[PDB]
Amino acid sequence: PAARFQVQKHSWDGLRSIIHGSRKKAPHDFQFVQKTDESGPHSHRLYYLGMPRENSLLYSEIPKKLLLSWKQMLDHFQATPHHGVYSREEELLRERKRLGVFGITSYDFHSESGLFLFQASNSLFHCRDGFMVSPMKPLEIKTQCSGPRMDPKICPADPAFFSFINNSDLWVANIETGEERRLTFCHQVLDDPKSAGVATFVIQEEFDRFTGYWWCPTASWLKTLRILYEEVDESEVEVIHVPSPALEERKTDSYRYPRTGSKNPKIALKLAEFQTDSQGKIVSTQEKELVQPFSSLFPKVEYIARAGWTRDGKYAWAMFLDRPQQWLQLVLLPPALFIPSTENEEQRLASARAVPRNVQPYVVYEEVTNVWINVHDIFYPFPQSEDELCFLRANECKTGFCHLYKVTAVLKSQGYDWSEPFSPGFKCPIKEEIALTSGEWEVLARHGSKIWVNEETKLVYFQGTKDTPLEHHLYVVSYEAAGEIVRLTTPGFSHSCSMSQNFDMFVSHYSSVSTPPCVHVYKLSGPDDDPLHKQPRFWASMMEADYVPPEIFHFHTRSDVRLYGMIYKPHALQPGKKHPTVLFVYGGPQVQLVNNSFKGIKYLRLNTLASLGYAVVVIDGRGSCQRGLRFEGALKNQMGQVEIEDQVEGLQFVAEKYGFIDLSRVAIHGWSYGGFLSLMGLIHKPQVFKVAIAGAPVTVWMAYDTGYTERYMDVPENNQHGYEAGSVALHVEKLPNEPNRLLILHGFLDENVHFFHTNFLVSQLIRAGKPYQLQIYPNERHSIRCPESGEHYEVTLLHFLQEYL
Amino acid sequence: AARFQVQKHSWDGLRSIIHGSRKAPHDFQFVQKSGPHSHRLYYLGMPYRENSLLYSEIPKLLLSWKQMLDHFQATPHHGVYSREEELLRERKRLGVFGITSYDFHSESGLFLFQASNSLFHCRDGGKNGFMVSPMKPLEIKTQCSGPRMDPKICPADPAFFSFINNSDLWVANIETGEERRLTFCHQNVLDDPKSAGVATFVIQEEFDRFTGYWWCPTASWEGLKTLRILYEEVDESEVEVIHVPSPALEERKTDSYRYPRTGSKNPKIALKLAEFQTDSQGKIVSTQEKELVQPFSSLFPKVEYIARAGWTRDGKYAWAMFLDRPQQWLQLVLLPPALFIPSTENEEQRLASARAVPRNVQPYVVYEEVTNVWINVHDIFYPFPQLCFLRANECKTGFCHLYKVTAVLKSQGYDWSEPFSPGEDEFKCPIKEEIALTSGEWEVLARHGSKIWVNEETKLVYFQGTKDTPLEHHLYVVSYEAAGEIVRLTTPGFSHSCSMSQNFDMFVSHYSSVSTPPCVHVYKLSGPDDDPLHKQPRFWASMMEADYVPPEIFHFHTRSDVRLYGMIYKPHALQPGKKHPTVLFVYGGPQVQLVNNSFKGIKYLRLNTLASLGYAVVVIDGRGSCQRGLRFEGALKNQMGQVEIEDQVEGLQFVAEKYGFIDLSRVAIHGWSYGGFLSLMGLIHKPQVFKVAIAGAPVTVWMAYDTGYTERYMDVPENNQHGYEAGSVALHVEKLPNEPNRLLILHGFLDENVHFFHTNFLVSQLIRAGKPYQLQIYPNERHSIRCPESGEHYEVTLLHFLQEYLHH
């Protein structure tokens, strides 16, 4: 009647000016340094990256006795290459981190020497920090190598040295003496498949590891410095072509992209040793391989998740995952199990006979599961004191929730003749395994989340949902006594925190649905006899700050499982009117759109929708993150099948509690996984969703990579019913016959979800005589960087809804 | 309101309409014989399945199409061709599964053709005897690995034949099974840029040549029977490389392509000679690479492309058509076989057999066509025995006409050992005479498979032309001996494609009109032999005879006093006084005429479907059009997209004044290929005129198009800044509508002619200009739609875009 609300129909010029009105990084990567000056006014110096232009190295002065200043470290200077055009290698590392920020995106620091190393321009730069006041020129490190120098790290044992990858080989260089040295020789495209120190595509894109080498923290005495590093051969991995950004050139780029049920790269851990004298020259280098082949020592291993060393460098270590990603073990690798590699079988067996029968790999932990093994970063080894090994470890697999565990595993040597080859199938006795935190909440140990362990006071600081899944909070618990867990961060808000290495101060970037992010400096003051109950006291603020925030709801299901949601309400609502509804979707795992943190930056378009009078509903459904393994396990082997049920469940719930929703004019829209679910919604529930606008969708699972699909959908061989059911390209017969009910968006340069996905869906749509609309983003990969396209993307989104909803 | 309104159909509705609406012998060979049948016409045809080798029996009435091959499938699994052949099939614009091109040797009666994977053959006629039941084709085995492109029988000896395999020339023997390789230019991708016998992408797409070798018609004997082949050696190393998607979509890989974009380096070219000797038993004995005594690029500087090549009928010379980069200077040159020396490793061995070459021997520049517009390449070049020869020459008058030329061959004598730079006309023969056999404001057909047939016994030259009217191809006869009376041999009112017997007694004519479907009538030429010019064409037998309202041809004069022709698809059941919406259908590129007197129903069925729903459809051959001579084609020179939209408006306002059922407030410009390019110019230059544009496979950037097409019309980018920057629709996106639903873009994702980049780059610039757009991909389609399932969709989207949007 007069009840149905009608969005003001605008001209396309009209929508451009509305959207142009819509748009009219905070401190991160923190290094705390104490001033070592009892009489001066500053107790600390915070180092970080931040903006006003580009990201850059900045510092604040923490006083002894309130906004801080952002003092610039670099004497003006530019870390962005002309026109923001990165190298091929650089731009492809910024997609795998979803990095969209120009300038210094990361750095390496050495508190002992004040050495700042960092990739900038198209080379490396460095600076030193007594304590300066005004900025300084960062000295460019001169090379004689050809291409870009990737993944720079300072040698912890000696800051005179540093490392980098160049043409997928490990190099080492001295910043003082400019001397550079290649340590590995795996390269000389497609013709060259071996690489060394490089984290391959699927390792970065789906296992969150980007470096493929690891400094030895200690030198052994000439001194000698080692580096652990993953040797890799992509010879058997399928090869695909994606269009270069240089469209004028009309050329592609080759990738090693292993589709599900395809060979992954052959992998191995190895050592690169080199010696140095008093004056500093690199006197010699040595390639070192495992005394037994990696593939036979650690069989069943498919991806190397993580690796590192003890703090003493006694042993190296590695997190190893099997193909079905249902099995995970941490292995102690002593530096002596590695020999000098050679072609002389005689020379090699004299090194193999010399490796003592006592030295051996110690499998120190193992995680089994019937769902899948999320890779958590957290594995902290305590220096061996009083034959054994004590360590903390975050274990979602034990109880189905990520929690911390202090573990001791016995290191009793079986003994082996390393000259003769053998085939096992090293599991240590666990001496004990104490639960430090438990419960139906969880510990944050993924996507850069970390702990900080003060051994002086015997406390583990961490980050968890203990209070609520809508808010990340900082927690301290003892690792001697598994007793009281003290929360230091204050409710209402979600926090991303950074602890000093002296555990005397923290920073907390925090925000809420209703208020923009702050970045506050809290000191930890109180009795030193009672450190578990240090009170956080606000010391200083580094950052304060048409938008109507949404509000979080919760509701249960016909399974009684609780789900949370957000609603943007139609701005200036007249209770009684029913409004057209846009259902904003993600629905994949490893994401949670619904949490108590300010949404206005990233989801500014959802408020713009609300400002035209659209109901924007957003619902974390079963499969979404932060809620533990059983809640995420809902997707496994049936992707696309469970997620829409909940989205319709939360949609109908929203219509009872809010009653401004017109169930007749609902629309589904998402990118990435969300696009994939926008198209499952229009197949299985077209009586519910009038239109679907699906962006960057996965239309064929068999064309997606192994590391993501197998973990959730298994191997095609074993789960065809699921691959076929969750492949929206095969169910195109069930997509609408009425035109204007489906808009397709895809970034033509997408090397993550390949434009082949839209391409093959349009092919199936044409065969089945289904209409469709299509937008291409010819200068865009999986996400849309360029502001120009963004406006266009949104102007199209508003016009498409206006005319056809 | 008296504004007609098209019925608004649901999407299923339009699918059922298009699906409703969609519910000729060629390559003829005449052979003589004795009982009831005089001849046997061999031909390719697709009897109501796939194109196949057929024969009719010309007796002393409708001819039966007899099967020559027994239960034989000539097309591979479904339509899954090799990559090399299916591009050969796109470059010839070939859309029929089965046998498409075949070779025939009348004396021995040898038929030879590409089929399925390999080569096949079957003898018939001559010394073997005539078949009455379909024959089984014999397989010619191969020790070669890849496909064998471009088979040809050796004219001088039918025991042998040639083929390209892996970018190299091979010769084999059908009898012995003996293969042998003659050219070693191929050893990989960019690391293997050399090739011999192959005609490079552009040659195929722009100069209409799909073979880079040519058999000698004769054999010589030195001191064993020696057979020669002229061939083009190719070096694509310095030619840009581009990646177009495979049709293996699930594979997610591309194919590389040596695509010379305009103002870019072209394949380094050269003519080499390949000799080989056979004995009594036909065993291949020696084989000889040979090459021009002096490099090709110093004997003939300024030559960018080998348009054409071949031999004289006695083999005394090999000839070639040479063309410059601008394409405004063409040459015909004889290359005496004695001008070729065996290629050798040694400086010292190369100067020995150079000293050895007689000074009397040399290349002779026979003919030299200059022009201020551009040289179209014309197939016709008939040398007589002995040098006298017939040639087609557009440049001379501005219309393509036959000329009889005598060239004087006088040697200047050259020291072939010493290195030699020629002067500006170092080899040009004195022309003794040059008589025009044909003249007038009408052209002889000499491109796209048009050919003359010359009867040396009677001194008559048989040709097809536009003499009567540009709307109709006709068969004419004239005498090269006496340039006098031109007798026409084909009925007027129809347009004829025609093929002449080598005995000049019967001819075929496949012909049609706007109003009548195609026929293939066989005609005998009778009349006393006293007078051969005036032999009446006597209808002998038919091979083919015989919803759709055919369109109406008209003509109008421009305000520049130029006569343009158009066509009108009348709105079915037209109520005079109603004003209907108008789909202006466009091409407008050169080398194309759409308005002629021939059946349009098969190719442009959508243009009658459009009419059935009640759209007016208007087709106009603006300037730049073909079949109207060089000054008419020349109108586009360095102005592509500047002259013809005016003509499309001019011919559209006209149709409005004449017929008076057109509604100029609802007109829609729509075309594919160059037509798409005009659609987008039409929406930039005349948005008051055209309310929606649907552009298919459009060229948006000329700087990303090939050299042979673009440089012949638009020059180098460094010599036509304005022209490239005016005729590039991607550079003028600011001038596209701020209003949405006024522009639909279409592009197949495997287009290797116009690269999908062109659209991709327009979409980049649309977005940068903040402009709406619609877009449809064709993921299994290059520069055209072969898969029907796509075609119907395309059509169903054309009706749906027009109905919802082309309004008020």
Author numbering:
A (entry chain B): 20 to 43, 51 to 78, 82 to 94, 101 to 164, 169 to 227, 232 to 264, 270 to 434, 437 to 475, ...
B (entry chain A): 21 to 43, 52 to 61, 65 to 79, 82 to 93, 101 to 227, 231 to 266, 270 to 432, 439 to 598, ...
Published text:
Dipeptidyl peptidase 9 **(**DPP9) is a serine protease cleaving N-terminal dipeptides preferentially post-proline with (patho)physiological roles in the immune system and cancer. On the molecular level, proteases of the DPPIV family are serine aminopeptidases that remove dipeptides from the N-terminus of substrates having a Pro or an Ala residue in the second position (NH_2_-XaaPro/Ala). DPP8 and DPP9 are the only known intracellular members of this family, both localize to the cytosol, the nucleus and associate with the plasma membrane. Here we identify an association of human DPP9 with the tumour suppressor BRCA2, a key player in repair of DNA double-strand breaks that promotes the formation of RAD51 filaments.
